[PDB]
Design an enzyme around this catalytic site. Structure first.
Site, PDB file in Angstrom:
ATOM      1  N   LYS A   9      95.225  65.613  -4.688  1.00 13.58           N
ATOM      2  CA  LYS A   9      95.520  65.818  -6.116  1.00 13.58           C
ATOM      3  C   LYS A   9      96.576  66.911  -6.328  1.00 13.58           C
ATOM      4  CE  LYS A   9      91.443  64.264  -8.552  1.00 13.58           C
ATOM      5  NZ  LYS A   9      90.625  64.730  -9.714  1.00 13.58           N
TER       6      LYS A   9
ATOM      7  N   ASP B 127      89.939  71.574  10.471  1.00 14.98           N
ATOM      8  CA  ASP B 127      88.523  71.405  10.138  1.00 14.98           C
ATOM      9  C   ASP B 127      88.024  70.072  10.500  1.00 14.98           C
ATOM     10  OD1 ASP B 127      88.538  74.032   9.277  1.00 14.98           O
ATOM     11  OD2 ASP B 127      88.249  73.543   7.152  1.00 14.98           O
TER      12      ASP B 127
ATOM     13  N   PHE C  68      82.973  76.585  -8.374  1.00 16.67           N
ATOM     14  CA  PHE C  68      83.581  75.354  -7.886  1.00 16.67           C
ATOM     15  C   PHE C  68      82.867  74.755  -6.705  1.00 16.67           C
ATOM     16  CE2 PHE C  68      86.878  72.732  -5.754  1.00 16.67           C
ATOM     17  CZ  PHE C  68      86.988  71.782  -6.746  1.00 16.67           C
TER      18      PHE C  68
ATOM     19  N   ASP D 249      80.701  71.324  -6.335  1.00 20.59           N
ATOM     20  CA  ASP D 249      81.120  70.363  -5.302  1.00 20.59           C
ATOM     21  C   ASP D 249      79.942  69.860  -4.473  1.00 20.59           C
ATOM     22  OD1 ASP D 249      83.785  69.269  -4.044  1.00 20.59           O
ATOM     23  OD2 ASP D 249      82.452  69.762  -2.359  1.00 20.59           O
ATOM     24  N   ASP D 250      78.990  70.763  -4.190  1.00 28.89           N
ATOM     25  CA  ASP D 250      77.752  70.506  -3.473  1.00 28.89           C
ATOM     26  C   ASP D 250      76.836  69.643  -4.347  1.00 28.89           C
ATOM     27  OD1 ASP D 250      78.846  72.199  -1.549  1.00 28.89           O
ATOM     28  OD2 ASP D 250      77.488  73.874  -1.977  1.00 28.89           O
TER      29      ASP D 250
ATOM     30  N   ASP E  78      84.875  69.610  12.899  1.00 34.03           N
ATOM     31  CA  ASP E  78      83.646  68.949  12.493  1.00 34.03           C
ATOM     32  C   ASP E  78      83.560  67.500  12.876  1.00 34.03           C
ATOM     33  OD1 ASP E  78      84.551  69.289   9.094  1.00 34.03           O
ATOM     34  OD2 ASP E  78      84.440  71.091  10.380  1.00 34.03           O
TER      35      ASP E  78
ATOM     36  N   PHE F 177      96.792  72.513   6.758  1.00 34.37           N
ATOM     37  CA  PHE F 177      96.520  73.145   8.039  1.00 34.37           C
ATOM     38  C   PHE F 177      95.007  73.390   8.241  1.00 34.37           C
ATOM     39  CE2 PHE F 177      96.057  77.982   8.492  1.00 34.37           C
ATOM     40  CZ  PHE F 177      95.663  78.052   9.810  1.00 34.37           C
TER      41      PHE F 177
ATOM     42  N   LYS G  98      85.628  81.143   2.968  1.00 34.72           N
ATOM     43  CA  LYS G  98      86.109  79.802   3.297  1.00 34.72           C
ATOM     44  C   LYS G  98      86.903  79.081   2.217  1.00 34.72           C
ATOM     45  CE  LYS G  98      84.922  75.435   5.444  1.00 34.72           C
ATOM     46  NZ  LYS G  98      84.033  74.733   6.412  1.00 34.72           N
TER      47      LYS G  98
ATOM     48  N   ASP H  93      80.780  79.928   8.548  1.00 31.76           N
ATOM     49  CA  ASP H  93      80.242  78.586   8.372  1.00 31.76           C
ATOM     50  C   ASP H  93      79.828  77.944   9.701  1.00 31.76           C
ATOM     51  OD1 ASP H  93      79.460  76.588   6.450  1.00 31.76           O
ATOM     52  OD2 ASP H  93      81.282  75.415   6.934  1.00 31.76           O
TER      53      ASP H  93
ATOM     54  N   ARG I 168      89.380  61.501   5.671  1.00 30.22           N
ATOM     55  CA  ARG I 168      89.825  62.558   4.757  1.00 30.22           C
ATOM     56  C   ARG I 168      90.589  61.820   3.656  1.00 30.22           C
ATOM     57  NH1 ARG I 168      89.224  67.610   3.290  1.00 30.22           N
ATOM     58  NH2 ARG I 168      88.647  68.002   5.478  1.00 30.22           N
TER      59      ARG I 168
HETATM   60  C1  LIG Z   1      84.793  69.477 -13.396  1.00 25.43           C
HETATM   61  C2  LIG Z   1      85.616  69.117 -12.180  1.00 25.43           C
HETATM   62  O1  LIG Z   1      85.336  68.099 -11.570  1.00 25.43           O
HETATM   63  N1  LIG Z   1      86.625  69.953 -11.840  1.00 25.43           N
HETATM   64  C3  LIG Z   1      87.558  69.855 -10.751  1.00 25.43           C
HETATM   65  C4  LIG Z   1      88.703  70.676 -10.765  1.00 25.43           C
HETATM   66  C5  LIG Z   1      89.637  70.674  -9.720  1.00 25.43           C
HETATM   67  C6  LIG Z   1      90.860  71.532  -9.808  1.00 25.43           C
HETATM   68  C7  LIG Z   1      91.784  71.187 -10.814  1.00 25.43           C
HETATM   69  C8  LIG Z   1      92.957  71.933 -11.002  1.00 25.43           C
HETATM   70  C9  LIG Z   1      93.218  73.035 -10.176  1.00 25.43           C
HETATM   71  C10 LIG Z   1      92.314  73.398  -9.160  1.00 25.43           C
HETATM   72  C11 LIG Z   1      92.607  74.499  -8.338  1.00 25.43           C
HETATM   73  C12 LIG Z   1      91.707  74.894  -7.329  1.00 25.43           C
HETATM   74  C13 LIG Z   1      90.528  74.162  -7.113  1.00 25.43           C
HETATM   75  C14 LIG Z   1      90.233  73.060  -7.929  1.00 25.43           C
HETATM   76  C15 LIG Z   1      91.120  72.647  -8.960  1.00 25.43           C
HETATM   77  C16 LIG Z   1      89.425  69.805  -8.633  1.00 25.43           C
HETATM   78  N2  LIG Z   1      90.328  69.766  -7.620  1.00 25.43           N
HETATM   79  C17 LIG Z   1      90.150  68.974  -6.531  1.00 25.43           C
HETATM   80  C18 LIG Z   1      91.191  69.059  -5.437  1.00 25.43           C
HETATM   81  C19 LIG Z   1      91.784  67.995  -4.912  1.00 25.43           C
HETATM   82  P1  LIG Z   1      93.025  68.302  -3.648  1.00 25.43           P
HETATM   83  O2  LIG Z   1      94.196  69.025  -4.199  1.00 25.43           O
HETATM   84  O3  LIG Z   1      92.212  69.018  -2.463  1.00 25.43           O
HETATM   85  O4  LIG Z   1      93.330  66.851  -3.065  1.00 25.43           O
HETATM   86  C20 LIG Z   1      89.013  68.146  -6.443  1.00 25.43           C
HETATM   87  C21 LIG Z   1      88.057  68.167  -7.468  1.00 25.43           C
HETATM   88  C22 LIG Z   1      88.268  68.986  -8.587  1.00 25.43           C
HETATM   89  C23 LIG Z   1      87.343  69.027  -9.637  1.00 25.43           C
END
Ligand SMILES: CC(=O)Nc1cc(-c2cccc3ccccc23)c2nc(/C=C/P(=O)(O)O)ccc2c1
Ligand SMILES: CC(=O)Nc1cc(-c2cccc3ccccc23)c2nc(/C=C/P(=O)(O)O)ccc2c1
Lengths: 343, 343
Positions: A50, A96, A232, A236-237, A100, A91, A193, A167, A105
């Site tokens: 993302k 990782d 966060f 995620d967990d 693991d 990286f 981490k 971890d 991924r």
């Molecule tokens: C409520 C909710 O589900 N929130 C939410 C928000 C973010 C997130 C958004 C914007 C900046 C961030 C900056 C730092 C951390 C997270 C984020 C998010 N990011 C990822 C990363 C994907 P990648 O880039 O690994 O491929 C995955 C799931 C996420 C879920």
């Protein structure tokens, strides 16, 4: 939405990053092949996610710098620094995934699992790390925040690696021990981490790019950002197990993989000696029978409500942190991100 | 002998390095365990070798700086920088040993082969790398050569990793192809993989510590140092096979391991289509019958004499480089090292 907008110019900047990182091959055709391999590595590993951490650099740069002081060049550097965050992550993920023994991924096969790659991905993971500093040199060497960025990426690699070590000590590859799965240990793993590179690093890099280099402002940003990081990971967990897999785009794995999830920590915190015994047997097994038995104990211990109360309390506390520590930065820097993190 | 002398104070300085690298644990007991693991890693991996690259930093610092400007503090930093070179090497060795599935290093079991370690050594190799920059910060942050050292270690990691990528592309894990074992390819692998960190890095770091920061002086040092590096590896390949194992402290492995040794390159450079065929079959096999058959072809092609003529010509050329490029540095800086490299 500041992020959604920015994504295009950010992803189109990757073409430049790769062109620039394969430019030393022109003056040294000897290493051309290694560079050609370097291209495969970046193209596979840095692309596909993302780009959320990378985009935070850009979003924050735009909110910390006067649109007048946001010339073409500053922006080119801003996208590069965001790319260095993605490169930092690529990286740790490559490494990782090897460590693991992961299979997939972002849905695609792990780089190391590719035929012909294998343990050679270790050197690949090191090359993604090298690119960070190569880019910082190519784009930022004349900037006063140059040493600042170098140091922050370095401090963040070490923070993350230290986190990884913690971890790896907590949940060993062939060892089942829920004793060391404490709240105090969990928060540390998450701080070192995940939190540092995911939350502190991207705003922190934009702060330095904006000339906000003060130890105290950074410490204020850190107070806020690390707490967001804690929420966060805990989310995620939760989303790993109880989250609907459509919206998330992930299926429950923590239980089978003996992972130090917040759920297990809470289960361990609130359990009769008999309830602990059931988990001891079921947690860590590749059998749908035992995996469903763990989810039944979490459900019984009302952990989805322990999480809802936690998310309520966390958002509250994060706003109380933003009020207290944002100044002199614009609160929008932290509010933009908090918006993304909480629902 | 400048080296032999210095070895004591250098090795006694390791106690300080570890104390200092385990000091963040005091203010953060949370990560204490990871730090305790960090101690095991350093204690195992950074100790045990001859410390030759690390000692070059010290030896060169002593020859580039006025004894008056060699106060207690400058020396403490000089031993630290030498230690960062050993730490850089310990990181490539830990990683390389994983990558090439090696069993032993310096006679002792590879770190990754230790029960309980395994692929967790990847994170360990990253931690040894992190320590370089941690030390540079702790000892050198107030020095004008600070950014200079950071950059050089970084440039050297990347040079080495790029070298490793080239080496991994040349002799793949399950592929036998002597076609890509060219002189031009060999020199590149040696330049990037070995020469830069082994020869340029230690003098280069002392040069910066002495305030010798000029692009041209460094380029002059590099001209000389990379050539010494080329001779060192070519000698290492020779000593691997033909060298008496008592003095060296190593037994012949290049042939079995399909390695891009200088011997194979020369054998390939001077061979009838029939002579090439014999090697094609015997080279790369874990059978004393075939290993001895390769040594019989090298012997027949008078490669031990192709090496003697090469060592004669190399020492000559290295002196011609020293004459030409030493100034304004003292020739003793390069002569001290050349003395160690050639017989
Ligand atoms: C409520 C909710 O589900 N929130 C939410 C928000 C973010 C997130 C958004 C914007 C900046 C961030 C900056 C730092 C951390 C997270 C984020 C998010 N990011 C990822 C990363 C994907 P990648 O880039 O690994 O491929 C995955 C799931 C996420 C879920
Ligand atoms: C004729 C001859 O055999 N030369 C000779 C000279 C040196 C060498 C000496 C001084 C500084 C150096 C600086 C850079 C490279 C080499 C050297 C040498 N080093 C090692 C490294 C051991 P470690 O420290 O890996 O555990 C091994 C064999 C060696 C042989």
């Amino acid at each position: 939405d500041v992020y959604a907008q920015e994504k295009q110019d950010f992803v189109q900047h990757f073409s430049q990053i790769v062109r620039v990182l394969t430019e030393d091959e022109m003056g040294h055709p000897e290493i051309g092949d290694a560079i050609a391999r370097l291209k495969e590595v970046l193209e596979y590993n840095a692309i596909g996610g993302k780009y959320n951490r990378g985009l935070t650099v850009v979003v924050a740069f735009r909110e910390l710098v006067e649109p007048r002081k946001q010339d073409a060049d500053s922006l080119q550097r801003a996208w590069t620094v965001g790319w260095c965050v993605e490169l930092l992550q690529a990286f740790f993920l490559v490494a990782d995934d090897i460590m693991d023994s992961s299979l997939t991924r972002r849905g695609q096969i792990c780089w190391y699992q590719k035929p012909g790659v294998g343990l050679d991905a270790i050197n690949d993971a090191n090359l993604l790390e090298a690119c960070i500093y190569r880019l910082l040199k190519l784009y930022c060497r004349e900037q006063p925040y140059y040493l600042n960025l170098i140091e922050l990426f370095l401090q963040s690699s070490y923070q993350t690696e230290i986190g990884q070590t913690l971890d790896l000590l907590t949940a060993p590859q062939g060892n089942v021990d829920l004793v060391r799965f404490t709240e105090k240990r969990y928060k540390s793993i998450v701080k070192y981490k995940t939190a540092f590179y995911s939350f502190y690093l991207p705003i922190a890099a934009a702060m330095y790019m904006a000339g906000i280099d003060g130890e105290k402002e950074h410490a204020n940003a850190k107070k806020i950002l690390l707490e967001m990081g804690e929420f966060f990971q805990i989310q995620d967990d939760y989303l790993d197990l109880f989250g609907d897999p459509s919206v998330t785009g992930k299926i429950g794995t923590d239980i089978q993989d003996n992972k130090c999830s917040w759920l297990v920590v809470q289960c361990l915190q609130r359990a009769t000696p008999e309830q602990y015994q059931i988990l001891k047997e079921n947690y860590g097994q590749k059998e749908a029978e035992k995996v469903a038995r763990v989810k039944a104990l979490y459900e019984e211990l009302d952990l989805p409500a322990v999480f809802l109360q936690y998310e309520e309390d966390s958002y509250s506390h994060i706003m109380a942190l933003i009020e207290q520590y944002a100044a002199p930065l614009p609160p929008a820097v932290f509010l933009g991100l908090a918006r993304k993190i909480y629902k």
